[PDB]
Structure 1
Amino acid sequence: PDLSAGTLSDIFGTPQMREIWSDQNRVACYLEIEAALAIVQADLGIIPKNAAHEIVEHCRVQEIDWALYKQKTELIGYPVLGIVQQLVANCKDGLGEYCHWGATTQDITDTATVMQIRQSLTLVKQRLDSIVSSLEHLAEQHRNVPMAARSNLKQAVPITFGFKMARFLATFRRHQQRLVELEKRVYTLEFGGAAGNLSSLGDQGIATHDALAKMLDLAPAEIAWHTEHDRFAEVGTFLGLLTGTLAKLATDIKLMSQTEVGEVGEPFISNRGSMQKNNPISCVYIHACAANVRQGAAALLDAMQSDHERGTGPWEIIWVQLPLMMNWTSAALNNADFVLRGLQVFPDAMQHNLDLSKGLIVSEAVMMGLGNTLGRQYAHDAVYECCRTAFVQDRPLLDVLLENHEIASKLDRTELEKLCDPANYLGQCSQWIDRVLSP
């Protein structure tokens, strides 16, 4: 088990995920399943015990002739019996004729794919843990930094940057719970034979299935699921849900990185953004990866139409989309991880953007305050008419408020500036942040 990369293979993928879904790890998973099967069937008394040992001793990927395997896969049409043929030829005294006993190739591919998935989700759980940790730090560190919230790409009312990070944090917490829920279904053995009923094992296939299952630390199956692809498809839809949030994160960050906005920046790495333009390339890659995974999810839903006891086409969609969606997702997870660990935050630009409306962004605040001293009704009417006068003449809301003599007589400039200061109107952002950090 040792170590193939093109120009972009580590841009839209990761080295780790590529290895999990490599031909070598796949065939290794195959050989692990075959070895465990032999051992299981030996204890049960189905196959000789000396044969099991010899099989296990040749269940090693390093002994695989790859060019021969490729050719035999293309001729046979499926990717297992080529490995079986070599396993049989590698065993001495014909003891290889006891491997693959009662198994069909989709038993090996489905169970391999579950093993590869479990390895894959270990990396995703790690990426998620780190992303969550960064968001926890970011929510606290930036708990009290004011900025303009945006609705339909227009300024709404002030919030804090840590508030925005708390909302991402709550989402990734949900994704984590979704992940652990699907694991109990997905981490399941597939061993049913040609038709799912293990006809060639007699009264023994279900003892074999139950023993093979926890030999490989997998849940026993209720019943065969060769054309019941809901375990594989829900992994795909989870990847779609997770990358969706990654894509929102990328959208918000690249939007806050605009020359005209300048409120955040990806972590500085010398000459990475390609004067000094630092393009949000991590956001760029996340976006493209999310787009490809969401369509790959639709392909895996499509794949669930596998007919009868082996799909004539739909099953084979999983061979292609699953590795790709894993690799794309890991690239997006890697990039968001990197961005959130060293994210630059520019409070002075957030402050400058808050001051663009010259107090109109806190029109409500002024109203609320002036209410007790002027009257709910006059407060509404006066602020609304003052806010609209400031809009047409490009003036501070304060300056127009001060031309209302009843307002000027009731409040001194100093009180009115605190009402006209966007930084004084954050509602309960910090208490909301606290509610997310609390668990």
Structure 2
Amino acid sequence: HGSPDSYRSPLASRYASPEMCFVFSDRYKFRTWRQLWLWLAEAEQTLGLPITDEQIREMKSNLENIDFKMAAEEEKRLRHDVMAHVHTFGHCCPKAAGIIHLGATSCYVGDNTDLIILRNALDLLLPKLARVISRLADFAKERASLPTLGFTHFQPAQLTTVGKRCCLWIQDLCMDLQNLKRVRDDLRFRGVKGTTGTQASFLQLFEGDDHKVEQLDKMVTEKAGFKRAFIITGQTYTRKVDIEVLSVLASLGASVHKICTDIRLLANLKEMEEPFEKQQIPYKRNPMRSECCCSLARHLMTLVMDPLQTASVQWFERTLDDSANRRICLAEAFLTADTILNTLQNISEGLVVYPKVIERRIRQELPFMATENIIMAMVRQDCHEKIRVLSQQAASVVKQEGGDNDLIERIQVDAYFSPIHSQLDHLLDPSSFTGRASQQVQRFLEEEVYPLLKPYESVM
């Protein structure tokens, strides 16, 4: 990762998985440059430019044989990123030197590489998000019936289930999964367009034949594995593309942050905890992996303003005031999302529920929500008011003298509630207060979640 004598990005050197790091590495970047020049030359041969099979063979064998030292020093001399690599690749491919980058300009390698990078980055996030959704869905099913105190205003609300509450987190990740897939499939190749998008150099190279330029653009698009290319660009693809991508990651950021806020709140209530590793026979447990996910999700929300501002200040066919900003924020958003999903998969595998803790809290709150079922079970005016005064004193005891709720007791002795004694244990059954929470979990998993997850069954 490098020396401690200098600053190191905590995302690469500490947080993110090596795979995502490699996608944004200089090796991947410059390999892809060489790959693009190969596809270019191959297509140009087919279209009748003087390129031999020996020159193609030379380029194919030397895609990974990159001299970084020599390339960086040639940049210093030629003050050009692309020209330096054209020359370097030429030195290790002496037969091909005269045909590399023929007709093209800088953005053929620069911009198309970012597109290939963008796509590859989404492709690694997809199964990670799919794997989180699946494990939460496992958990959702097991705890689909378990009654838990609902919360609105973070206050005692009617009963829900742990499996129901989990399905709220799952659905947000599902909207995100659908969004990531939609953006990945819509990405288009820039292809060959020239300095200003007019294909003027390539038109001159193919001595004025429009049809040949059209074919060239089709051929590299397909070699690159892209279904579609832009008809219209300036020098580069429209920077709107980066907004579309980072908007969805920002949206994922906000969903994750919400999931982790919930878990941190439940971990205070002792109702649920993060998984442990290295475990066996501490009381105090910090939800550190959830606090980490929040911290990083935040940064993922912040980054969306960068591509927005960039897109707004692009003058005409392009200005280079996007270049540096894009080298930073694109990498960060993906490495940030990658980390979040790796850490979120850990949290989701074995979430620890504490049933008796959840049952205790419910018992403290249920007699204040069961009052209506007591009245509609007596066969109204003197039963709405005579139970109310008992609630007055029981609510006065809980707040003014912090402790247990004894409303059950106050009814269990009063003469007025004579017949309703025989049916109190059934009237205070927690599951009868949970509504369709169980039915809803089931139907959600079968109609929405399972159809979505199936294309990912190979890797779990």
Deviations along 1:222-264, one digit per CA (max 9) or x if unpaired, are 3226161122221111111112111111111122112xx1122
Residue 310 of structure 2, aligned match among 269, 287, 303: 303
Distance in structure 2 (CA, Å) of the matches to 1:181 and 1:137 = 26
SS of match in other structure, 1:438: helix
Tell me if the contact between 1:267 and 1:344 (Cα under 8 Å) persists in the aligned partners.
yes
Give 1:11 shift.
Answer: 4.3
1:224 is matched with which residue?
233
Q: How far, CA to CA, are the matches of 1:76 and 1:291 in structure 2? A: 41
Change (3 A) 1:66 1:393: same
Residue 398 of structure 1 corresponds to: 408
Deviation (angstroms), 1:378: 5.3
Letter of the aligned partner of 2:86 in structure 1?
V
**Structure 2: which amino acid aligns with 1:177?**
Q
- In the TM superposition, residue 26 of structure 1 has moved relative to its aligned partner by 1.2
Any idea what SS the aligned residue of 1:143 has? Answer: coil
Do 1:140 and 1:162's aligned partners in 2 also have CA atoms closer than 8 Å? yes
Residue in 1 aligned with 2:63? Answer: 60
CA spacing shift, 1:83–1:417, aligned 2, 3 Å:
same
After TM superposition, give the deviation of residue 374 of structure 1 in Å. Answer: 5.0
Q: How many residues align?
A: 424
Shift of 1:402: 4.4
Aligned to 1:327: 335
Contact persistence 2:23–2:117 (CA under 8 A): yes
- The one-letter amino acid of 2:311's match is M
In structure 2, distance between residues paired with 1:81 and 1:378: 92
Q: For 1:89, which of 77, 86, 91 is the aligned residue? A: 91
CA 253–97 in structure 1, closer or farther in 2 if over 3 Å, else same: same
The answer as to 2:289 corresponding to 1:282 is yes
- Which of these residues, 265, 268, 273, is aligned with residue 265 of structure 1? 273
* 1:3-402 paired onto structure 2 within 5 Å: 4=1, 8=10, 9=12, 11-50=14-53, 52-54=55-57, 56-57=59-60, 59-61=62-64, 63-73=65-75, 79-93=81-95, 95-202=96-203, 203=210, 204-218=212-226, 219-224=228-233, 226=236, 228-258=238-268, 261-270=269-278, 275=282, 277-305=284-312, 306-357=314-365, 359-360=367-368, 363=369, 365-375=370-380, 380-394=384-398, 395-402=405-412
Distance in 2 separating the partners of 1:380 and 1:420? 18
Paired residues of 1:227 and 1:310 also in contact (CA < 8 A): no
For the 8 Å contact 2:188–2:229, the answer to whether it is kept is no
Q: 1:438: which partner in 2?
A: 446
Amino acid at match of 2:367: G
Change (3 A) 1:367 1:271: closer
Shift of residue 79 of structure 1? 4.0
Structure 2 Cα separation of the partners of residues 382 and 79 of structure 1: 85
Counterparts of 2:55 and 2:311, CA distance in 1: 36
Code of the residue aligned with 2:391 in structure 1: it is C
Picking from 430, 436, 446, the partner of 1:428 is 436
Distance 1:392 1:216, change over 3 A: same
Amino acid at match of 1:285: C
Aligned identity (percent) is 18
Cα deviation 1:361-411 (Å, max 9, x = unaligned): xx2x43045215253x555555544433311023423233446643x1341
Question: Displacement, 1:143?
Answer: 1.0
Q: What code does the residue aligned with 2:310 have?
A: A
The one-letter amino acid paired with 2:266 is M
Q: Is the Cα contact below 8 Å between 1:387 and 1:397 reproduced in 2? A: yes
1:411 paired to 2:420: yes
Change (3 A) 1:308 1:58: farther
Shift in Å, 1:72 = 4.3
Residues 23, 181 of structure 1: alpha-carbon distance in 2 compared, 3 angstrom cutoff: same
Contact 2:140–2:166 (8 Å) recurs in 1 = yes
Taking the aligned partners of 2:94 and 2:75, their CA distance within structure 1 comes to 24
- The normalised TM-score by structure 2 is 0.85
Q: Rate the CA distance shift 1:236–1:341 in 2: closer, same or farther, 3 A.
A: same
C-alpha distance in structure 2 between counterparts of 1:87 and 1:230, whole Å: 33
Q: 1:7 to 1:296 in 2, by over 3 A?
A: closer
